[PDB]
Design a binder for this molecule. Structure first.
Ligand SMILES: *[C@@H]1O[C@H](CO)[C@@H](O[C@@H]2O[C@H](CO)[C@@H](O[C@@H]3O[C@H](CO[C@@H]4O[C@H](CO)[C@@H](O)[C@H](O)[C@@H]4O)[C@@H](O)[C@H](O[C@@H]4O[C@H](CO)[C@@H](O)[C@H](O)[C@@H]4O)[C@@H]3O)[C@H](O)[C@H]2NC(C)=O)[C@H](O)[C@H]1NC(C)=O
Ligand SMILES: CCCCCCCCCCCCCCCCCC(=O)OC[C@H](COP(=O)([O-])OCC[N+](C)(C)C)OC(=O)CCCCCCCCCCCCCCCCC
Ligand SMILES: *[C@@H]1O[C@H](CO)[C@@H](O[C@@H]2O[C@H](CO)[C@@H](O)[C@H](O)[C@H]2NC(C)=O)[C@H](O)[C@H]1NC(C)=O
Ligand SMILES: *[C@@H]1O[C@H](CO)[C@@H](O[C@@H]2O[C@H](CO)[C@@H](O)[C@H](O)[C@H]2NC(C)=O)[C@H](O)[C@H]1NC(C)=O
Ligand SMILES: *[C@@H]1O[C@H](CO)[C@@H](O[C@@H]2O[C@H](CO)[C@@H](O)[C@H](O)[C@H]2NC(C)=O)[C@H](O)[C@H]1NC(C)=O
Ligand SMILES: *[C@@H]1O[C@H](CO)[C@@H](O[C@@H]2O[C@H](CO)[C@@H](O)[C@H](O)[C@H]2NC(C)=O)[C@H](O)[C@H]1NC(C)=O
Ligand SMILES: *[C@@H]1O[C@H](CO)[C@@H](O[C@@H]2O[C@H](CO)[C@@H](O)[C@H](O)[C@H]2NC(C)=O)[C@H](O)[C@H]1NC(C)=O
Ligand SMILES: CC(C)CCC[C@@H](C)[C@H]1CC[C@H]2[C@@H]3CC=C4C[C@@H](O)CC[C@]4(C)[C@H]3CC[C@]12C
Ligand SMILES: CC(C)CCC[C@@H](C)[C@H]1CC[C@H]2[C@@H]3CC=C4C[C@@H](O)CC[C@]4(C)[C@H]3CC[C@]12C
Ligand SMILES: CC(C)CCC[C@@H](C)[C@H]1CC[C@H]2[C@@H]3CC=C4C[C@@H](O)CC[C@]4(C)[C@H]3CC[C@]12C
Ligand SMILES: *[C@@H]1O[C@H](CO)[C@@H](O)[C@H](O)[C@H]1NC(C)=O
Ligand SMILES: *[C@@H]1O[C@H](CO)[C@@H](O)[C@H](O)[C@H]1NC(C)=O
Ligand SMILES: *[C@@H]1O[C@H](CO)[C@@H](O)[C@H](O)[C@H]1NC(C)=O
Ligand SMILES: *[C@@H]1O[C@H](CO)[C@@H](O)[C@H](O)[C@H]1NC(C)=O
Ligand SMILES: *[C@@H]1O[C@H](CO)[C@@H](O)[C@H](O)[C@H]1NC(C)=O
Ligand SMILES: *[C@@H]1O[C@H](CO)[C@@H](O)[C@H](O)[C@H]1NC(C)=O
Lengths: 243, 667, 208, 96
């Protein structure tokens, strides 16, 4: 029914619509950053789907186990291409930083690099969540739920929480990725992509809803705390901000 | 999508309950738009309706009946409680109901015969004899919920297995709220009557673009031929005499396109086609002092569509055989059963008050008994009690002329057919069943006892028509054969895609021959499967082949012989030449014409008429059905509460963080 | 800056009216400027309001829809060709572009629309083109919102790169083909190429 | 824009609503509100202060008439005969 549709939509696009409405929609510069980030994510997904199309039409579809291994390898190379084009979009924001601000501008900062990291991560999050949940939301309008062939009835709600977790993780990943790129701490550059691999690899355990969704929110709480401390705040910054 | 494959299961062999409309009423079934959803509850005893009518926690149920429980009283109890039933599915029963089942009325085509309060007042609403004695009137009730038929057993096993998996109630307690359900889509676009629907569809077809037509006249064609060819571009002379032989061509049932019609329709025109090919083989057939017209009326269930149309065109001068020309009329009713080799001869008693007509009918019955004495398997009887005429096509001609007519049938009183206008009126009703160790090519040519009975009926009928045309010398030559009868019976009642039905049709029409048997419902699709099959079968059984090229066969105008006025031509397929695909096509010089069968209420456009069968069919879109699971309202309220909670929490946390973006972030 | 956002909110609200029409109605499966608009404000409104009520199956009468078309087309005529508010001037150009967009998706055949747009861009108001281009992605194929929203984003980057090109090449720009080159490719790059790679991930319920 | 052009606006702009155009009066009472009932900085406001008073009772006049026709049609649609069907633009399918 429509109750399940508007329930599961607000679980998926709850935080993303909140950040887009409060934060980004007031600042008319950031929308271009948002659309450019979503564009580079689309080019990443296209470049990965080319490779998977190649492998599925070369290996000739016969053995289903080898097709499953190719599906794993295609998801892995899609993760790697997302974390390459995040670096590419970082370099384009660095090139369009100087070429527009402080050389065609008097004041050197209409937007800092931190807000660009934030909006780039939110852009990846919005477009990935839209490609993950919208086809599932179109079936929530039906009168019937999943589970006739021995599946779980909680398919819609669990996919909604997975979409929301992926949105928040891309948002935090963009910030920590750009702060790793500036200071040239290349070990954190590996930890962001490794955590991306783990959060897209635990979705292979996925019908086992007990311990395949709790670790994703464990990684999300860890990544949120480390993105918060990385951005500048601390516990002293929280305990002295209630005036 | 791959998620609706995890939610739904389609149902593939279904037959809906389609709404039709009359001038003053409507009949049939209708869902809402976007289906009717309900929990499945099977019924295997009459005690189980406590759970649906009174003791159901989840009120809008959807009952699943074996078809031996699809009674009248059960339908009264469901129609009298409709806020708790939205739907019904009916599974067919292989040991057919030995009590008999007929969904038509107690007395069919009542207000469209001859008998009125002005003509036949003691016989009027069949007070003397109830014809369809088992008829429970169920196919003429309006219904507010879908009723589908499950033609397959495996679909029924799927649905009952899902019922056993989910919907059970243990230890006198509630069912566990993930429950199975089923959804039925039949939203009929029509309303109260055919006057309303025809007007409402006439405005949309005229005063606007995109004509949104909602109703449809039931119309088809009347196939008819001659024994000797006539001009077809004028009329006949006022002293020419033909002898009409006539037979209905269709049937129906409670459900939409399941119209098996074995005893009521198929056997009668099969024995008339056999009579036609028996009479055509007479050695002196060109010099008969009279002519013989065969006619196969279609629309006869729905208040005599084709018969009233033939009468109306016969008196409005638009038919080459005028009503002056009709000498005698031999209708052929139901002839399949014949309980003691008896064949009853029904006449009209009211028009025999005229003395000369009475003497002509007595001469007709003497002719019938003289031609039938030569056959030892048919015993002609006449009804002792002077009783009325059964519902047949002579009851439209007798509204005009008082022709000397008789109706042959196998029943004196009520119908012997236990399944008149029912789904059960299949080949097993008339004992038509083949042995199991034969190829389905030899099943075409295997001879049954029913074929040998109808061959004797056709022999009696053909010799009767030969004597009625004044043949008087070659009567023993006229004899049908069981081969053509059993090929026609296998063609209509068992498998339509024969090796013999393919070699009589044109190349264009081979899509009409499906896998199963032909269903005999007059549909809005204006030529039907059955109309073409009967036309080309009559064209073989009467016509001859000629040497013509196909371009000559399209138009024989260039040939000095082979007239276009008298005969009619067709380029049919041939038989299969073996080891390849080589049809050997040829022309047929036949007389199997077609005539329009669409009632004159739709030609005079007086859509609220009381003598011309104002029957229309609703139009629809996407009859489909599917099953799925449903979830509790607790889970819907919980998922909406979690949606609101996460949305409000995200907005509050974002508005709190953004307002303190100064203090919380330092460089 | 501000002005590119003044080119988003027009071309976005034009697409939301088109896509919510394609996915709901399911039917589209003082010289020349006066005469060509009277048959666009009064005749296409009479069709679009007529068809949107056939979907929901409600009964509106002739004393209302004749009043409603008269209160829409004539106010729309006196807003553009006379003095009105800028907001209502802006809100009417969105509606007339969608009405001119929806008449192309019905009337043009199967894949001729992939030829017209191309030819036009090669040989080269702007709203109509974008609208038609999308709505073709909003109906064809199965029900897949991936192609509809990939072609949504692929237009705005062609829109942004136009004004990035205009800030260096000042004189004149065609504006169309940059949104078209990324739009024509990214239909045929996700309808048949990514739609497999999504539906296998959606089969095993996977995430990237 | 001066007060002379605003007076030349909102007299012909009101005068257009007598050709059965209540949406014109709607955007009239929606548009000259914070510029005729907020700031008292005009001597030439008394025409504009009066016209929106003349336009408020004019629009809501139609809101009575239009919904009193819509309800009296939708309730009395099947109870009327074909008279309730010749003037029906769209007709719902399954329901009478
Ligand atoms: C269009 O198609 C519809 C569908 O069939 C036709 O509707 C049928 O019209 C018949 C007209 O004769 C109706 O028959 C009459 O129904 C009366 C109502 O009886 C009620 O039914 C229950 C059923 O058990 C009875 O117990 C109750 O008594 C109810 O009153 C009957 O009274 C009537 O019987 C009469 O009895 C008197 C007794 O003196 C006789 O003198 C008289 O001759 C007659 O026998 C008769 O049965 C039929 O009910 C109705 N069908 C339905 C489902 O309603 C339309 O007529 C068609 N329109 C045309 C042809 O224009
Ligand atoms: C930006 C994100 C937009 C998400 C839109 C999600 C819509 C959805 O899930 O269901 C649409 C639903 C259902 O879409 P659908 O894809 O299920 O419809 C076609 C598929 N069949 C025929 C099988 C049902 O659309 C409607 O019911 C029509 C009205 C709404 C149309 C869309 C409104 C939003 C448009 C973009 C903003
Ligand atoms: C009705 O036919 C449909 C096909 O149109 C059947 O659906 C398929 O069922 C098989 C076996 O269950 C699956 O492997 C396919 O994936 C189904 N195809 C679909 C859903 O498109 C359906 O099972 C049939 N109905 C019944 C009751 O058996
Ligand atoms: C058919 O025959 C019947 C039986 O004679 C005719 O009915 C008689 O008609 C005359 C004059 O029309 C009237 O006296 C009565 O209507 C009937 N006589 C009786 C009942 O004794 C009938 O007119 C003939 N013709 C048709 C067209 O039905
Ligand atoms: C009557 O004729 C129609 C049309 O020739 C047959 O309908 C066809 O049925 C086959 C089998 O399902 C389909 O593949 C075709 O697409 C149908 N064509 C049309 C135009 O509907 C129908 O089967 C025939 N009836 C019988 C009993 O054989
Ligand atoms: C009627 O039966 C004939 C003969 O079995 C069918 O014709 C064959 O159909 C198969 C499969 O469709 C083809 O491969 C053959 O080439 C056909 N021709 C032959 C054997 O000569 C025909 O399809 C059937 N018709 C219907 C409507 O089912
Ligand atoms: C009607 O169909 C039958 C099919 O059997 C045709 O009979 C065959 O005709 C050919 C030549 O005409 C003979 O070689 C066969 O031996 C016949 N088969 C039989 C009698 O079983 C018959 O010719 C057709 N009739 C018309 C007029 O077309
Ligand atoms: C994917 C998740 C689980 C990875 C978790 C890695 C954890 C253990 C690591 C990754 C990088 C680390 C941080 C890197 C830098 C600093 C700043 C320093 O002044 C205090 C410690 C602190 C804040 C570290 C704490 C621990 C830390 C957050
Ligand atoms: C469907 C049936 C036939 C096969 C199931 C294969 C399962 C057991 C395999 C295949 C893919 C595997 C995952 C692939 C990648 C990762 C990421 C890594 O950081 C932790 C292990 C983890 C999460 C694996 C766990 C085991 C796994 C889920
Ligand atoms: C039938 C019983 C005995 C065994 C199976 C129970 C399953 C279906 C139940 C038990 C525990 C449940 C989980 C408990 C908590 C959460 C976290 C929440 O954020 C999303 C739903 C999720 C992930 C639930 C999904 C459904 C779940 C996995
Ligand atoms: C029904 O199922 C049985 C068991 O598999 C199968 O043998 C039979 O052919 C099926 N019949 C139909 C009509 O599906
Ligand atoms: C009747 O037949 C003759 C042939 O003898 C033909 O000339 C004429 O056209 C036919 N039709 C009529 C008279 O309508
Ligand atoms: C009887 O029928 C004949 C022929 O139809 C007719 O000439 C005669 O007038 C009729 N007689 C009566 C009394 O109706
Ligand atoms: C013939 O019909 C009778 C009864 O109708 C039936 O018992 C019998 O099996 C049928 N077949 C044969 C070969 O007698
Ligand atoms: C058979 O009888 C008819 C009846 O008139 C007659 O014309 C014919 O000549 C007879 N047959 C023969 C061979 O004489
Ligand atoms: C039959 O027709 C063919 C072609 O029209 C012709 O060549 C042949 O002579 C004809 N044969 C006879 C016996 O008429």
């Amino acid at each position: 029914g429509a109750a399940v549709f508007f329930g599961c939509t607000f679980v998926a696009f709850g935080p993303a619509f909140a950040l887009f409405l409060i934060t980004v929609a007031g600042d008319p510069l950031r929308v271009i950053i948002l659309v450019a980030g979503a564009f580079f994510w689309l080019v990443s997904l296209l470049l990965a789907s080319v490779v998977w199309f190649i492998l599925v039409h070369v290996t000739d579809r016969s053995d289903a186990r080898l097709q499953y291994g190719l599906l794993i390898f295609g998801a892995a190379v899609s993760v790697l291409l997302q974390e390459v084009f995040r670096f590419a979009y970082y370099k384009l924001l660095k090139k369009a930083d100087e070429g527009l601000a402080s050389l065609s501008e008097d004041g050197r900062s209409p937007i800092s690099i931190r807000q660009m990291a934030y909006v780039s991560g939110l852009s990846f999050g919005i477009i990935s969540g839209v490609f993950s949940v919208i086809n599932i939301l179109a079936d929530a309008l039906g009168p019937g739920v999943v589970g006739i062939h021995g599946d779980s009835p909680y398919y819609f709600l669990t996919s909604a929480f997975l979409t929301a977790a992926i949105i928040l993780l891309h948002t935090f990943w963009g910030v920590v990725f750009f702060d790793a790129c500036e200071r040239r701490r290349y070990w954190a550059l590996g930890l962001v992509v490794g955590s991306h691999l783990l959060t897209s690899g635990l979705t292979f355990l996925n019908p086992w809803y007990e311990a395949s969704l709790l670790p994703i929110y464990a990684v999300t709480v860890s990544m949120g705390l480390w993105a918060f401390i990385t951005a500048g705040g601390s516990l002293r910054s929280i305990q002295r901000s209630l005036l | 999508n791959s998620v609706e494959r995890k939610i739904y299961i389609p149902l593939n062999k279904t037959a809906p309950c389609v709404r039709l409309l009359n001038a003053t009423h409507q009949i049939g079934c209708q869902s809402s738009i976007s289906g009717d959803t309900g929990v499945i509850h099977v019924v295997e005893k009459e005690e189980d309706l406590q759970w649906v009518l009174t003791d159901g926690p989840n009120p809008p149920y959807m009952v699943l009946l074996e078809s031996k429980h699809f009674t009248r009283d059960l339908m009264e109890k469901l129609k009298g409680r409709t806020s708790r039933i939205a739907g019904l599915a009916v599974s067919l029963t292989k040991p057919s109901p030995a009590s008999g089942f007929s969904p038509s009325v107690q007395c069919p085509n009542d207000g469209f015969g001859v008998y009125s309060n002005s003509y036949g007042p003691e016989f009027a609403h069949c007070r003397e004899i109830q014809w369809n004695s088992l008829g429970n009137g169920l196919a003429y009730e309006d219904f507010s919920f879908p009723i589908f038929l499950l033609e397959d057993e495996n679909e029924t096993k799927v649905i009952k297995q899902c019922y056993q998996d989910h919907n059970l109630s243990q230890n006198g307690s509630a069912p566990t709220f993930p429950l199975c359900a089923m959804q039925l889509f039949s939203h009929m676009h029509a309303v109260i009557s055919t006057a309303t629907c025809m007007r409402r569809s006439s405005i949309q077809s005229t005063f606007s673009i995109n004509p949104e037509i909602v109703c449809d006249p039931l119309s088809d064609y009347n196939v008819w031929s001659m024994l000797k060819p006539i001009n077809t571009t004028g009329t006949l002379k006022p002293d020419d005499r033909v002898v009409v032989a006539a037979t209905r061509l269709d049937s129906r049932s409670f459900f939409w396109n399941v119209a098996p019609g074995a005893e009521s329709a198929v056997a009668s025109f099969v024995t008339q086609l056999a009579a036609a090919e028996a009479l055509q083989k007479a050695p002196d057939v060109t010099t008969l002092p009279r002519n013989v017209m065969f006619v196969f009326f279609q629309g006869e269930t729905f208040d005599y569509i084709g018969s009233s149309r033939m009468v109306y065109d016969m008196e409005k001068g638009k038919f080459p055989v005028q009503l002056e020309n009709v000498d005698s009329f031999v209708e052929l009713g139901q002839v399949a059963l014949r309980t003691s080799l008896e064949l009853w001869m029904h006449t009209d008693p009211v028009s025999q008050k005229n003395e000369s007509v009475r003497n002509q009918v007595e001469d007709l019955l003497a002719t019938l008994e003289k031609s039938g004495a030569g056959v030892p398997a048919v015993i002609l009887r006449r009804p002792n009690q002077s009783q009325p005429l059964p519902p047949s096509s002579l009851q439209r001609f007798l509204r005009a002329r008082n022709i000397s007519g008789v109706v042959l049938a196998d029943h004196s009183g009520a119908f012997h057919n236990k399944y008149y206008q029912s789904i059960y009126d299949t080949a097993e009703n008339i004992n038509v069943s083949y042995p199991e160790w034969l190829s389905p090519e030899e099943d075409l040519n295997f001879v049954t006892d029913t074929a040998k009975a109808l061959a004797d009926v056709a022999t009696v009928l053909g010799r009767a028509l030969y004597e009625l045309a004044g043949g008087t010398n070659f009567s023993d030559t006229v004899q049908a054969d069981p081969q053509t009868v059993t090929r026609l019976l296998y063609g209509f009642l068992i498998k339509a895609n024969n090796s013999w039905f393919q070699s009589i049709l044109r190349q264009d029409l081979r899509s009409y021959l499906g896998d199963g048997p032909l269903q005999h419902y007059i549909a809005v699709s204006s030529p039907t499967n059955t109309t073409y099959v009967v036309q080309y079968a009559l064209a073989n059984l009467t016509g001859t082949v000629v040497n013509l090229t196909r371009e000559q066969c399209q138009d024989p105008s260039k040939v000095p012989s082979e007239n276009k006025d008298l005969y009619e031509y067709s380029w049919v397929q041939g038989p299969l030449h073996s080891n390849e695909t080589d049809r050997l096509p040829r022309c047929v010089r036949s007389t199997a014409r077609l005539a329009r069968a669409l009632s004159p209420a739709f030609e005079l456009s007086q859509w609220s008429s009381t003598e011309y069968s104002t029957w229309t069919e609703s139009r629809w879109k996407d009859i489909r059905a599917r099953i799925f699971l449903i979830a509790s309202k607790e889970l819907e309220l919980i998922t909406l509460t979690v949606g609101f909670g996460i949305l409000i929490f995200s907005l509050i946390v974002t508005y709190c963080i953004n307002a303190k973006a100064d203090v919380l972030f330092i460089a | 800056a501000k002005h590119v956002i003044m080119l988003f909110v027009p071309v976005t609200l034009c697409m939301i009216v088109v896509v919510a029409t394609i996915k709901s109605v399911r039917f589209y499966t003082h010289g020349w400027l006066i005469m060509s608009s009277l048959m666009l404000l009064f005749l296409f409104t009479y069709i679009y309001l007529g068809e949107v009520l056939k979907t929901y199956n409600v009964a509106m009468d002739y004393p209302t829809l004749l009043l409603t078309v008269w209160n829409f087309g004539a106010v729309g005529m006196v807003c553009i060709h006379w003095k009105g508010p800028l907001v209502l001037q802006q809100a009417y150009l969105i509606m007339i572009s969608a009405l001119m967009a929806l008449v192309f998706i019905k009337y043009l055949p199967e894949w001729s629309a992939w030829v017209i747009l191309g030819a036009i861009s090669v040989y080269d108001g702007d709203f109509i083109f974008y609208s038609v281009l999308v709505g073709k992605a909003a109906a064809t194929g199965s029900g897949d919102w991936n192609t509809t929203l990939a072609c949504f984003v692929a237009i705005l980057i062609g829109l942004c790169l136009t004004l990035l090109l205009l800030a260096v090449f000042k004189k004149a720009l065609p504006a169309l083909p940059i949104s078209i080159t990324f739009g024509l490719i990214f239909y045929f790059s996700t309808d048949n190429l990514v739609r497999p790679f999504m539906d296998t991930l959606a089969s095993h319920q996977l995430y990237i | 824009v001066s007060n002379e052009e605003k007076l030349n606006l909102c007299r012909k702009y009101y005068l257009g609503g007598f050709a059965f155009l209540p949406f014109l009066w709607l955007v009239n009472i929606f548009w000259f509100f914070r510029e005729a009932f907020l700031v008292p900085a005009y001597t030439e406001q008394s025409q504009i202060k009066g016209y929106v008073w003349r336009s408020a009772v004019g629009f809501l006049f139609w809101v009575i008439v239009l919904t009193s026709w819509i309800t009296i049609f939708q309730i009395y649609r099947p109870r009327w005969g074909a008279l309730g069907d010749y003037l029906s633009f769209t007709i719902p399918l399954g329901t009478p």
